[PDB]
Amino acid sequence: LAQQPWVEKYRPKNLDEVTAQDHAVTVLKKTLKSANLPHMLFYGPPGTGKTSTILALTKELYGPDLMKSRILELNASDERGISIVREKVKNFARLTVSKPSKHDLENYPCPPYKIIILDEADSMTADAQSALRRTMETYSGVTRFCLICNYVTRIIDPLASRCSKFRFKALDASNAIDRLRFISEQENVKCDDGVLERILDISAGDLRRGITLLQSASKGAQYLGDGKNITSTQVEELAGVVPHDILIEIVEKVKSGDFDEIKKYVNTFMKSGWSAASVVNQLHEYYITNDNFDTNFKNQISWLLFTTDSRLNNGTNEHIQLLNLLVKISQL
Amino acid sequence: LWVDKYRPKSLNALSHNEELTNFLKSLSDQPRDLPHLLLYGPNGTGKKTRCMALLESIFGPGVYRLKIDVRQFVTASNRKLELNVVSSPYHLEITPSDMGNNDRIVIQELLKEVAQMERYKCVIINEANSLTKDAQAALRRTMEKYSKNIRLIMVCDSMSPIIAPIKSRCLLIRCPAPSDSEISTILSDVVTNERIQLETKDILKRIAQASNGNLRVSLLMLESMALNNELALKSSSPIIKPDWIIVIHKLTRKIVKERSVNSLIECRAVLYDLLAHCIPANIILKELTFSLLDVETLNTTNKSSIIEYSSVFDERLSLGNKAIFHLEGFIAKVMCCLD
Amino acid sequence: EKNIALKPFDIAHKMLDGQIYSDIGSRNFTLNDKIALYFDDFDFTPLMIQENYLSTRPSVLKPGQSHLEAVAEAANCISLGDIVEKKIRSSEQLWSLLPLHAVLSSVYPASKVAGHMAGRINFTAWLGQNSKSAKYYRLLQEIHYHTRLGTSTDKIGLRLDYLPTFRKRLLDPFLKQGADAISSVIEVMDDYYLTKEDWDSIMEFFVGPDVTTAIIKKIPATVKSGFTRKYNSMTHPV
Amino acid sequence: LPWVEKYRPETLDEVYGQNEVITTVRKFVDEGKLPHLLFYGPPGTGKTSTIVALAREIYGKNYSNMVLELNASDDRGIDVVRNQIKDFASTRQIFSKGFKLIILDEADAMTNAAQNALRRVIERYTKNTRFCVLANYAHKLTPALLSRCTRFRFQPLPQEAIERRIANVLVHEKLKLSPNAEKALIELSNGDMRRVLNVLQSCKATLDNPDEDEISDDVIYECCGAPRPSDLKAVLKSILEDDWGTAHYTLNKVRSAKGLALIDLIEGIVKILEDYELQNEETRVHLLTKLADIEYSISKGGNDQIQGSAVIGAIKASFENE
Amino acid sequence: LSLQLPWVEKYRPQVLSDIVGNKETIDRLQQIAKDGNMPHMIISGMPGIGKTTSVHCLAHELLGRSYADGVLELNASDDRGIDVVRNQIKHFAQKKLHLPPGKHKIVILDEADSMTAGAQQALRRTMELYSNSTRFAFACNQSNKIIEPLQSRCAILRYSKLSDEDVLKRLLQIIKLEDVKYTNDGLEAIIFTAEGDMRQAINNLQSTVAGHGLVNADNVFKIVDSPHPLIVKKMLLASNLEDSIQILRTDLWKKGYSSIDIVTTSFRVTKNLAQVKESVRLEMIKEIGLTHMRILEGVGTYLQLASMLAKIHKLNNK
Ligand SMILES: Nc1nc2c(ncn2[C@@H]2O[C@H](COP(=O)(O)OP(=O)(O)O)[C@@H](O)[C@H]2O)c(=O)[nH]1
Ligand SMILES: Nc1ncnc2c1ncn2[C@@H]1O[C@H](COP(=O)(O)OP(=O)(O)O)[C@@H](O)[C@H]1O
Ligand SMILES: Nc1ncnc2c1ncn2[C@@H]1O[C@H](COP(=O)(O)OP(=O)(O)O)[C@@H](O)[C@H]1O
């Protein structure tokens, strides 16, 4: 087949192929049984199957052929704000509804409305969501909106009231690793022990990021050409994750507490090119979930890490911020 | 200059980071399926050289037939903008951060023009980490749209300012700075090519250590030292440092020696002199901080206070507008903690 | 009319007076009056305060507080006021933050170091330095445009790393060889598409011990005349 | 039809709360006069309700031929809606009352140029048309636009009147509402009657058996998409009592499963902590300062896990002061 | 009450001697009217300081009571466009009118900052074309938005925020022109709300007179949208943090007041807290401004106000 992202390639086709989402799948099947389809609001952890399930529902509603004409997939995270997204929605709604063929009508319901899908709707501002609600109520006759978001509480009350809400449970690690293993076996990807587990850990359970990272690792293995199994260090390099050995060395340097030793180690470390934000994230993960530190140490170090992350997010010098963070922790 | 005369013009001519060279050679073996690249690492390590070497491996030596042109763009309020675009018969190089916040429209217009004019043409974006978030979103949209004819090779020093959506669509490649042995080998090759007399090879090791892994800095330092010593480097030959670094070290010694308001006024004068001659404020702050931390007379408490104030005022510089306001505050805070 | 130029000096002198910061002086001259003093000329008052707040002899020092600590606090507040000013000038609707900028840039920093003016109220030097920095950045941009093909660096890298070495190839040979180094200097300039104007501009970027004004002045006029004559007598790459 | 339109009162007798505004408006209706009016305040106070009540009391059966309602947020912008205003002002009828009436809603959501256009239009048609401007705040408008219309500030309705209206809606719609659901709805809508009616109508639709089922507070919170107090209380209890690992796990699990943003979680936890009886005031000072800093940092982006652990540490550290 | 022209224009002055704001501007305008040589002028400043009224008075002081063609006012940000406004200006300037020697026409360019560089250059060309009979006064927001070729020929008048004394002096005119029953607290409240804004002060006075007639603080702040300064003062000066938070939550946040209004009123009240040492007032103002900046960046929550109160309480109790 032609080159295609593995995220789009391995989306479930129909509702019956969505795993670990039986509650939302059942409610959506019941809604599909009814002729009227209300506005929908898909929320849950990222990479659980929101877009996959809405696409499967659309394909069951319209059929594989008519689906492309009745769907406007938009992402609300793009800049220029309300104007572009609302103008595109208005143009799609004012566009004449495509006439289904004889085959489409006899085999699929082909309802007379066109589904509009907004991704990352929670990132919209309050004014943007109010304008979206205005647009939804203006063209409510011929368009049904589906909002995909991670947090339902970020959606304003007037907009959330108009939409039936479907909660997607976070994927069990077993289900995610089984899906990744199936994808790897289908694509003939050689992996060592714990490579898929490492991919899931790096992606924090996000199956979308896990699939993307697996595809990148497969491409890197093809580039290497040796035919050997993909290793954990390769996926760590691809994801921009500092090796655990360097993190342990940083922890030991902090524990010793010498200012000059810490400064020298940070100077050496900044030459390797590892991202400082990744170091801060991994230090947070190591220290917070460690049973060898008491409550007061974690109370202080959480604020230290928060301050360092806030300063790093402002576009500052990584070397100075990392050195300050490591020096402050060594004094705890 | 020797830094430019002996720059590797091909993937075979690279001498350090062998694994990265092998990876880049494999990428050129399949030109059709070339992914978008994001190259990150310390400054002066060979990122641009490797970009050009990969381009030469794909398209041939014609990538080095570079010509420069000025493209004129217009924005909403008829503000004519000019951007310098270095072009070849095969690729383009742009630095949209030169346009400030107007980088978004420039990127959109130029990428649309290149896509319309078109197997594909590579666009190299320098200082990708300093792009605005809106510009990065526009770059992601152009990646999604014109991926058939446009392949992006972004170069940055830190990958953190890059937005997450871009990172997923690009191949992250890490360029560690060369070790001291590799820098010494490169300098040895340069001095053998230029016929420079060396009393001992330890001179090259000292130059490598003084450069702190910056290959460009080490090469330029070697050239400067050779010219000073009549093309004959001795074991007693001093390491030559740039003028601004010498000024900053003098300022550090002045701050450590005396801590008073008059000293602060004279430090203000020195900082004005440095800023007026195209020395960036962040560079001044970093050099001043790391010169202060190297003073032997200071104790642990003083150094901790210095690094904390450096972090605070680095954030304030990034969020600020007038550079001299923050550097003076940092120096004033440092003087109080030492006294 | 003609006293407009003297108005920022009067405002800076009045706001740094330590009398109006004592209890009686505060009662006679309230905080509203000080913010109004800022708003008399809001373009120059923050600059004048930042310029002149090191030249005072503080009389409002707290017990156990030195002059340097008050200066550090004033500088910290001035930095915060600069951040506020940047946020104000960004967009246009943030004019409501003008009193906050007044306090953070003019009133509060003056409160810490208020006293007797030890000398004279000097006009702000930030405007001239900003113009000088802009001019030198334009010159650096032009030089980078000329030398971009031959060098692998950005503009800042060109200033920090390349230019110190260019000095040893474009100016140092004149000191040791005289007019005999004209050919080598021209050859180096040709390799980077550097004109005589670029050669003049490059020598203006050096600071500290590397200043070239006196060194260039000490070069014999015959050497410079021969250099420019030889440059004008031959064609150059463009 | 939306329940907002269905239960909009047809006469001034059914309006509550704003006794002074009702009396002043009733004087205008009794005398048959209609001057320029400016109604402003929190949403859901009954501005449009009062104006339509007075218009239907004055004009009567010919309400459609006398008035026109407009929204400043419509797709037509400002020029096209001004053209519509001109077209309505140029309407000719066989018989008509003293003046026309045009309703402009959300006037404060327009640029100063649109306010200038409205200023230049208001006195243009005074001879045969009267203008009313609706907004959330009056001082937020440009001063010259403020002076063209009579000031009438609207204040949030008392809770007793809101409860009476909710009971009336319940008995009219044959809805069964738990008292806890009533308290949750009143707290969430904080006096906005439009929010109350919209949530009540939407909750009825979600009932598989609307004729016999009862709406619980869980249904209300699901419909509004708001953090449940029970979840926030559980998170706070885990933070205060359990160790760091348990608190971190509980916070992440709850706010990922229930889909609560970290900023909304912080807001809810702050609201809950206000009722706590703390012996030391430094506890409150540290809590407020640290939580505000974290909330500000969240708006700029940053690491989400780090911010969550920062919230946990800020809450734990402050309570060390007892 | 019947249909009345608003007092923002009904009782506008018609002579330069009856204007109190910007005494330097008054002196210069009187001198220019006496001399008869009208120069170019920039009168940019914050809105509501009555620059349009001042130039309107200046026109009829330079000339006689002639207004039909000698005085023109227009908005540079008009919906009709820059070209239409420029054409109207050219038509007015080229329109012949009986002018006394030296008494040139005056054109007021309200909101002149909207003019681009090319539009400003075209306006300069038009001014040079009609320099023998026309002069320009620019009523824009900012002087820095006007190009140097225009500014070099203008007599720079740096209009700034009016002081409370000027506001009181100007409002005394309306006070004596209207049958006002009032108390000192009411006038103090009216001056407090405007804060140097003449148009806002006049509008608030007219609204208070229309609504209640009597001018007392309670009715004035029942008219005004801003939170009552007494409530904010009680919130700020409370010796116990829980009392401050309780006052906030009950009287300000639950009353529908926006966070912006709350921080603005807190900033205004803290400036005038004469019973508190000025250093403490400066610290409190710094905290209030920090929370104001946080609100203007889009946070604007109740937690920010609570933290502001906590920091102010920490400062007060040391
Ligand atoms: N001999 C040699 N020189 C190198 C190599 N890599 C980089 N350099 C030198 O390093 C200098 C600066 O590298 P540059 O392209 O600016 O990398 P960047 O600034 O980090 O993107 C170039 O002038 C090269 O001469 C290498 O592999 N071999
Ligand atoms: N329940 C599921 N069953 C099978 N695959 C899934 C499921 N959820 C996610 N995926 C995988 O994740 C990828 C895309 O995830 P997506 O549904 O876009 O995440 P999100 O829920 O954030 O929209 C698809 O390739 C799909 O194979
Ligand atoms: N004081 C009140 N008395 C009775 N009903 C009210 C009152 N205020 C609001 N309502 C109800 O709220 C509904 C819509 O309120 P509305 O007037 O649209 O709010 P807004 O003032 O934002 O326009 C109306 O149907 C009305 O029945």
Domains of chain C are 7-124 (1.20.272.10), 127-232 (no CATH)
Please give the radius of gyration of chain D, using alpha carbons only, rounded to the nearest integer.
25
What is the C-alpha to C-alpha distance for residues D263 and D31, in angstroms, rounded to an integer? 52
What is the C-alpha to C-alpha distance for residues B21 and B157, in angstroms, rounded to an integer? 19
Q: E107 and E33, same structural domain? A: yes
In this structure, is the dihedral angle defined by the CA atoms of residues C231, C235, C237 and C238, taken in order, positive or negative?
Answer: positive
Q: Select from C158, C129, C157, C133 the least CA-distant residue to C146.
A: C158
Residues 6 or more apart whose CB falls under 8 angstroms from that of E172 comprise none
Q: D51 and D191, same structural domain? A: no
Inter-chain residue contact A314 with B319, CB threshold 8 Å: yes
D181 touches chain E (CB under 8 A): no
What is the C-alpha to C-alpha distance for residues D197 and E155, in angstroms, rounded to an integer? 61
Q: Who lines ligand 1 at CB under 6 A? A: B 3-4, 6-8, 14-16, 43-49, 155, 186, 215-216; C 152-153
Look at chain C and count its residues.
238
Burial grade of C6 (CB within 10 A; 0-12, 13-18, 19 or more): exposed
Tokens of E260: 């912006």
DSSP state of B126: E
DSSP state of E215: B
Q: D and C: touch, per 3+ CB pairs < 8 A?
A: no
What is the C-alpha to C-alpha distance for residues B73 and B70, in angstroms, rounded to an integer? 10
Candidates E279, E281, E293; nearest CB to C87: E293
Question: Which chain D residues touch E79 with a CB distance below 8 Å?
Answer: 79, 113, 116-117
Q: What experimental approach yielded this model?
A: cryo-EM
Q: Select from B153, B78, B158 the least CA-distant residue to B123.
A: B153
Q: At what angle do helices B243-257 and B281-292 cross, to 10 degrees?
A: 50
- Coil/strand/helix, residue B41: coil
What is the C-alpha to C-alpha distance for residues B93 and E316, in angstroms, rounded to an integer? 58
What is the C-alpha to C-alpha distance for residues D1 and A137, in angstroms, rounded to an integer? 12
Q: D150 and D12, same structural domain? A: yes
B2-174 — its CATH code?
3.40.50.300
Tell me the nearest-neighbour CA distance from D94 into chain A, angstroms. Answer: 33
Find the angle CA(A6)-CA(A12)-CA(A17) to the nearest 5 degrees.
140
What is the C-alpha to C-alpha distance for residues D315 and D87, in angstroms, rounded to an integer? 61
What is the C-alpha to C-alpha distance for residues B208 and B202, in angstroms, rounded to an integer? 10
Q: Which chains touch C (3 or more CB pairs under 8 A)?
A: B, E
For residue C115, report the phi and psi dihedrals to the nearest 5 degrees: 175, -140
Q: D80 and D22, same structural domain? A: yes
Strands C115-117 and C56-58: antiparallel
By CA distance, what is C26's nearest residue in E?
A: E278
Distance set, CA A144 to CA A147, D199, D208, E275 (Å): 10, 19, 21, 62
Looking at domain B180-233, which of 1.10.287.1260, 1.10.8.60, 3.30.70.20, 3.40.50.2300 is its CATH number? 1.10.8.60
> Contact at 8 Å (CB) between B306 and B293?
yes
Q: D137 and D69, same structural domain? A: yes
Find the angle CA(A270)-CA(B329)-CA(B264) to the nearest 5 degrees.
110
Q: Select from E8, E4, E28, E7 the least CA-distant residue to E16.
A: E28
By CA distance, what is C23's nearest residue in E?
A: E277
What is the C-alpha to C-alpha distance for residues E92 and E86, in angstroms, rounded to an integer? 10
Fold exhibited by the domain B243-338: Zinc Finger, Delta Prime; domain 3 (1.20.272)
Question: Which chain C residues touch E285 with a CB distance below 8 Å?
Answer: 31, 100, 103
Ligand 3 touching residue D136 (CB < 6 A): no
Residues 208-267 of D with CB under 8 A from A: 222-227, 243-245, 248, 256-257, 259-261, 264
Candidates B4, B283, B319; nearest CB to C160: B283
Candidates A153, A305, A306; nearest CB to D259: A153
The binding site of D for ATP comprises 4-8, 16, 41-49, 136, 194
DSSP state of A172: P
Question: Which of A312, A321, A327, A331 is best to mutate for the B interface (most B CBs within 10 A)?
Answer: A327
What is the C-alpha to C-alpha distance for residues A247 and A281, in angstroms, rounded to an integer? 11
Last residue within a domain, chosen from D226, D249, D281: D226
- Total domains in chain E come to 3
Q: E25 and E117, same structural domain? A: yes
Tokens of C209: 């011990």
Q: Please give, one letter per residue, the 3-state secondary structure of chain D.
A: CCHHHHCCCCCHHHCCCCHHHHHHHHHHHHHCCCCCEEEECCCCCCHHHHHHHHHHHHCCCCHHHHEEEEECCCCCCCHHHHHHHHHHHCCCCCCCCCCEEEEEECHHHCCHHHHHHHHHHHCCCCCCEEEEEEECCCCCCCHHHHHCCEEEECCCCCHHHHHHHHHHHHHHHCCEECHHHHHHHHHHHCCCHHHHHHHHHHHHHHCCCCCCCEECHHHHHHHHCCCCHHHHHHHHHHHHHCCHHHHHHHHHHHHHHCCCCHHHHHHHHHHHHCCCCCCCHHHHHHHHHHHHHHHHHHHCCCCHHHHHHHHHHHHHHHHHHC
- Coil/strand/helix, residue B3: helix
Residues 1-40 of C with CB under 8 A from B: none
Distance B49 CA to ligand 1 centre (A): 5
Q: Select from E120, E159, E124 the least CA-distant residue to E142.
A: E159
Of ligand 2's listed atoms, the one at least distance from the Cα of A42 is 21
Rounded-to-10 torsion of CA C106, C108, C114, C118: -40
Ligand 3 touching residue D4 (CB < 6 A): yes
Question: Which of B78, B80, B319 is best to mutate for the E interface (most E CBs within 10 A)?
Answer: B78
Question: Which chain C residues touch E165 with a CB distance below 8 Å?
Answer: none
Q: D239 and D133, same structural domain? A: no
- Coil/strand/helix, residue B272: helix
Tokens of B334: 């440092």
Distance set, CA D48 to CA A131, A157, D51, D104 (Å): 20, 21, 5, 10
Mutate to test the pocket of ligand 2, among A8, A26, A52 (most ligand atoms within 8 A of CB): A52
- Total domains in chain D come to 3
Residues 21-60 of A with CB under 8 A from D: 38, 41, 43-45
Q: D141 and D62, same structural domain? A: yes
Q: Which chains touch D (3 or more CB pairs under 8 A)?
A: A, E
DSSP state of B60: -
Mutate to test the pocket of ligand 1, among B216, B221, B222 (most ligand atoms within 8 A of CB): B216
Buried/exposed code over E125-152 (b: 16+ C-beta within 10 A; e: otherwise): ebbeebeeebbbbbbbbebeebeeebee
Question: Is B142 among the annotated ligand-binding positions?
Answer: no
Q: D147 and D162, same structural domain? A: no
The parent domain of residue D165 ranges over 158-226
Q: How many CB atoms lie within 10 A of CB B28?
A: 16
Last residue within a domain, chosen from D157, D190, D217: D157
Rounded-to-10 torsion of CA B195, B196, B197, B198: -130
Burial grade of A265 (CB within 10 A; 0-12, 13-18, 19 or more): buried
Question: Which chain D residues touch E249 with a CB distance below 8 Å?
Answer: 274
- Coil/strand/helix, residue A77: coil
Q: D115 and D9, same structural domain? A: yes
Pure H helices in A71-125: 82-94, 102-107
Distance B54 CA to ligand 2 centre (A): 36
Distance B217 CA to ligand 1 centre (A): 10
Inter-chain residue contact A157 with D195, CB threshold 8 Å: yes
Question: Which chain E residues touch D151 with a CB distance below 8 Å?
Answer: 207, 210-211, 223
Question: Which chain B residues touch E118 with a CB distance below 8 Å?
Answer: 78
Distance C196 CA to ligand 1 centre (A): 29
Tokens of A18: 């969505």
Question: Is B185 among the annotated ligand-binding positions?
Answer: no
Domain ranges for chain B: 2-174, 180-233, 243-338
The parent domain of residue E127 ranges over 3-162
Q: Select from D40, D109, D100, D52 the least CA-distant residue to D77.
A: D109
What is the C-alpha to C-alpha distance for residues E313 and C108, in angstroms, rounded to an integer? 20
Q: Select from A70, A74, A75 the least CA-distant residue to A57.
A: A70
Question: Which chain E residues touch D40 with a CB distance below 8 Å?
Answer: 225
What is the C-alpha to C-alpha distance for residues A319 and A310, in angstroms, rounded to an integer? 15
Ligand 3 touching residue D235 (CB < 6 A): no
Tokens of A313: 């997010």
Distance A249 CA to ligand 1 centre (A): 30
> Contact at 8 Å (CB) between D144 and D119?
yes
Residue type, D289: T
Q: How many CB atoms lie within 10 A of CB D60?
A: 10
Distance A75 CA to ligand 2 centre (A): 17
Candidates E203, E224, E258; nearest CB to D147: E203
Inter-chain residue contact A300 with D195, CB threshold 8 Å: no
> Contact at 8 Å (CB) between A32 and A61?
yes
Tokens of B194: 């230029």
Buried/exposed code over D170-204 (b: 16+ C-beta within 10 A; e: otherwise): eeebebebeeebbebbbebbebbbbbbbbbbbbbb
Please give the radius of gyration of chain B, using alpha carbons only, rounded to the nearest integer.
23
- Coil/strand/helix, residue E107: strand
Question: Which chain E residues touch B77 with a CB distance below 8 Å?
Answer: 116
> Contact at 8 Å (CB) between A223 and A62?
no
> Contact at 8 Å (CB) between E88 and E22?
no
Last residue within a domain, chosen from D171, D198, D226: D226
Ligand 2 touching residue A45 (CB < 6 A): no
Q: E199 and E120, same structural domain? A: no
Distance D182 CA to ligand 3 centre (A): 18
Ligand 3 touching residue D193 (CB < 6 A): yes
